[PDB]
Design an enzyme around this catalytic site. Structure first.
Site, PDB file in Angstrom:
ATOM      1  CG  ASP A  85      44.604  53.312  36.904  1.00 49.22           C
ATOM      2  OD1 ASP A  85      43.698  52.529  37.208  1.00 49.22           O
ATOM      3  OD2 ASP A  85      44.411  54.257  36.124  1.00 49.22           O
ATOM      4  CG  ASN A 106      36.047  44.913  31.130  1.00 52.37           C
ATOM      5  OD1 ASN A 106      36.628  43.860  30.858  1.00 52.37           O
ATOM      6  ND2 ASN A 106      35.042  44.966  31.986  1.00 52.37           N
ATOM      7  CG  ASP A 127      39.880  50.297  36.366  1.00 50.47           C
ATOM      8  OD1 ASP A 127      38.931  49.542  36.599  1.00 50.47           O
ATOM      9  OD2 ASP A 127      39.796  51.213  35.521  1.00 50.47           O
TER      10      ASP A 127
END
EC number: 2.7.7.65
Length: 161
Positions: A36, A44, A79
């Site tokens: 991850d 983002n 992700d």
């Protein structure tokens, strides 16, 4: 575009079934890392998709620089990534995970305001144990990943019973 190299998750079952049969017959190790990108959605949202896309490229390159052509790197989710390592012992699997974790931590990436964004990975690792169901292997690596997330991120956890 290193991003175009990533394998699509639709190929997970086919590749795993092949590698599981291979491991059973040859007695070689087989292992999974589920990875991850810490804080990816927050990053983002704060900095926008150019920054996010750049992070995904840098992380992806860290994977490719640390695995072999006989290993597999998949995009697993928004992700998250899955790496399938073939012929890496438990020790080598952990060493590979650590090289990747360290490389991302040391990556300098500038935001629009000139600050360096702190990047890190959470990684769950698990060894194949001879059982035919690849979904079980993913689940145990994911349990280890969840523990990595809950223990504070920027770390590797190996599944054990």
């Amino acid at each position: 575009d290193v991003l175009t190299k990533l394998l699509n998750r639709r190929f997970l079952p086919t590749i795993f079934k092949r590698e599981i049969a291979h491991a059973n017959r040859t007695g070689t190790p087989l292992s999974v890392l589920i990875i991850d990108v810490d804080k990816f959605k927050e990053i983002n949202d704060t900095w926008g998709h150019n920054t996010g896309d750049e992070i995904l490229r840098k992380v992806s390159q860290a994977f490719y620089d640390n695995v072999r052509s006989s290993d597999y790197v998949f995009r697993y989710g928004g992700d998250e990534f899955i790496i399938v390592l073939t012929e890496a012992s438990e020790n080598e699997t952990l060493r590979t995970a650590e090289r990747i974790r360290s490389r991302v931590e040391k990556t300098k990436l500038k935001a629009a305001n000139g600050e360096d964004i702190a990047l890190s990975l959470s990684i769950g690792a698990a060894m194949f144990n001879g059982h035919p169901d690849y979904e079980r292997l993913i689940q145990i690596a994911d349990e280890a990943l969840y523990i990595a997330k809950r223990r504070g991120r920027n770390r590797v956890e190996l599944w054990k019973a």
